Design a binder for this molecule. Structure first.
Ligand code: SEQ
Length: 305
């Protein structure tokens, strides 16, 4: 079995009305939100979404989706709802791009060269453990560690060419007393202890998946504080999970990367440290407004290119 392309199997693809202004897969899927997508063929993005493998590709006006499960067929309208939810396609980006463009002139400039930078709505467990794997790491090496984590502890879904896709591990799988030693063997280093000890904390102390739904329904301030009780989850990782899985669109994760960007392109300086990081966060919330994390995604994606 091989990765599908739109050209070679058109009947297996369902289309979503989606202009390049609302979504660019190439500025979203590889741009440090999810680490589960690879361009396995030009303009064709393959990855695990809701425990199934998908390939996504787009033309000027449409997003095209295929799902690998039986006999091959088009995604059902119900299956496509997972895709709509993941890309938050209810949110009209054009309205957000204008509002940011008005209140910030550098952004306005970047925005018309980098259309369709959306924020994924990610599964809380996948997002939490992926961003625990993100510390002191580039996108390349994070992607590798997450792949090896899922290979070890997640269910095998399918093989396409020489890529074996796994579901994201459950809390139960990551909480086991052998997990930390095995994840060290896979090169996660110090992040191994964080993954295993956080899985255990969530299961035994916080009450499982119910806690991450509770944090979804809570304020940014509550949810951020709540996440920072987990081994390996400080301001940076808490802000990532807040923005990308817990619907806190005002969350702005700040590292040395976001800092070289604000230094150069915004003539900012601390009046890199916890105190200086929080100031920077506050600035971007003051400037861009209640969806500041989304505006940050445009600049970060832009900067990676
Ligand atoms: C490794 C992996 C991912 C990221 C990352 N992802 C951003 C997070 C906020 C918006 C969208 C994606 N951001 C940053 C900096 C804050 C800019 N560093 C990373 C280092």
């Amino acid at each position: 079995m091989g990765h599908r392309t739109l050209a070679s199997t058109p009947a297996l693809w369902a289309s979503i009305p989606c202009p390049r202004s609302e979504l660019r897969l190439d500025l979203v899927l590889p741009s440090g939100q999810s680490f589960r997508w690879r361009e396995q063929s030009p303009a064709h993005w393959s990855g695990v979404l809701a425990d199934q493998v998908w390939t996504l590709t787009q033309t000027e006006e449409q997003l095209h989706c295929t799902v690998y499960r039986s006999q091959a067929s088009r995604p059902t309208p119900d299956e496509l709802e997972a895709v709509r939810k993941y890309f938050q396609l209810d949110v009209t980006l054009a309205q957000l791009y204008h509002h940011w463009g008005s209140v910030d002139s550098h952004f306005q400039e970047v925005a018309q060269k980098f259309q369709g930078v959306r924020l994924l709505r990610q599964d809380p467990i996948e997002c939490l453990f992926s961003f625990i794997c993100s510390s002191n790491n580039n996108i390349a090496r994070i992607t590798g560690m997450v792949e090896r984590l899922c290979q070890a502890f997640g269910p095998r879904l399918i093989q396409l060419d020489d890529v074996t896709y796994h579901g994201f591990p459950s809390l139960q799988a990551l909480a086991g007393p052998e997990v930390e030693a095995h994840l060290r063997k896979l090169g996660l280093g110090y992040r191994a202890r964080y993954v295993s000890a956080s899985a255990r904390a969530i299961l035994e102390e916080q009450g499982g998946l119910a806690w991450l739904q509770q944090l979804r329904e809570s304020s940014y301030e509550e949810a951020h504080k709540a996440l920072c009780i987990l081994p390996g989850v400080g301001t940076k990782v808490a802000d990532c999970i807040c923005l990308m899985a817990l619907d806190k669109p005002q969350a702005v994760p700040v590292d040395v990367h976001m800092w070289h960007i604000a230094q150069r392109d915004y003539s900012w300086h601390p009046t890199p440290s916890p105190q200086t990081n929080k100031e920077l966060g506050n600035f971007f919330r003051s400037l861009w407004g209640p969806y500041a994390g989304w505006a940050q995604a445009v600049l970060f994606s832009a900067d990676l290119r």
